[PDB]
Design a protein around this ligand. Sequence first.
Ligand SMILES: [Ca+2]
Ligand SMILES: [Ca+2]
Ligand SMILES: [Ca+2]
Ligand SMILES: [Ca+2]
Ligand SMILES: [Ca+2]
Ligand SMILES: [Ca+2]
Ligand SMILES: [Ca+2]
Ligand SMILES: [Ca+2]
Lengths: 171, 170
Amino acid sequence: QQQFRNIFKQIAGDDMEICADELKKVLNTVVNKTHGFTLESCRSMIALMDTDGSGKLNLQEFHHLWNKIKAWQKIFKHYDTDQSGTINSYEMRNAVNDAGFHLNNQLYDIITMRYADKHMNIDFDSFICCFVRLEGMFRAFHAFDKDGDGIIKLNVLEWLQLTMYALEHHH
Amino acid sequence: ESEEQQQFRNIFKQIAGDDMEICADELKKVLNTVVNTHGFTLESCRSMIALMDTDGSGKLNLQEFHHLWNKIKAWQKIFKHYDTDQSGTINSYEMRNAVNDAGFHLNNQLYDIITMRYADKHMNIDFDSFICCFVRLEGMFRAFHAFDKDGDGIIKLNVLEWLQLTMYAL
Ligand SMILES: [Ca+2]
Ligand SMILES: [Ca+2]
Ligand SMILES: [Ca+2]
Ligand SMILES: [Ca+2]
Ligand SMILES: [Ca+2]
Ligand SMILES: [Ca+2]
Ligand SMILES: [Ca+2]
Ligand SMILES: [Ca+2]
């Protein structure tokens, strides 16, 4: 992680961790070309990759976030054949499935309604935002499902753990 | 009491518009101008509505708002009790007590999660976050008992049910 370490150091600043603002800046500087990451996205990335609960991303946490964005970008580029900077809503079903998320029709429509624009396309920022929320929601759940069957039984404090973790707070 | 309900009818008559019901934007207006920045955010008002919209209309009628108001009053009294230095904030130990004072029994993991989500970089909770946390806590307790139809204290969820909930309800 030669100058990856160095990129992290520049933006992280004095506390050596990355808050939402620093993440936007680094992400829009290095993943580049309207087509940029919003502060909404970067906050949900922090919220969901912040594994030690510090509230900001350290190097290790940032590096995992980064490998995730790249892999998701590969899938975007694969479906945006006509370089439009967007994929239509049908391709999103495919994208999500390719990235490992086998869902259902109710969920595919929720995703389209939430993340598609008025032409029914989905830009990269929305694309990444949606995948961040799916991975984050899946990992929150998975922590109670180490056996892997996709089914969990919860008591009330377990459900409060899950849900209070899942509900982001922005102010 | 009755007078406060009259007062509140008069606020609604002014800002609720024709439906006499308040959406999240309208609630924001009300709370931040029955007070005189800090103040409640849209995000928090969205959660207040999720909590107290007991008829599922998506907005608050007068009675639902009155109930909300009362809870905010009660929680505010708890907040005061701990913000002794008048700082507008309370610290993280103070939140555990405030939480327990408000009736919620939780555990150490929940205290860490509350801190991660509601505390600033100094590990203090401002009032917007305090109330926002409290309504979510109460809302989530209500969800649980509503999902637990047999009452055995346990709920079954699959990953898709979960992903379904987290995309609209949360
Ligand atoms: Ca920093
Ligand atoms: Ca961290
Ligand atoms: Ca395209
Ligand atoms: Ca299981
Ligand atoms: Ca209205
Ligand atoms: Ca209502
Ligand atoms: Ca204080
Ligand atoms: Ca049950």
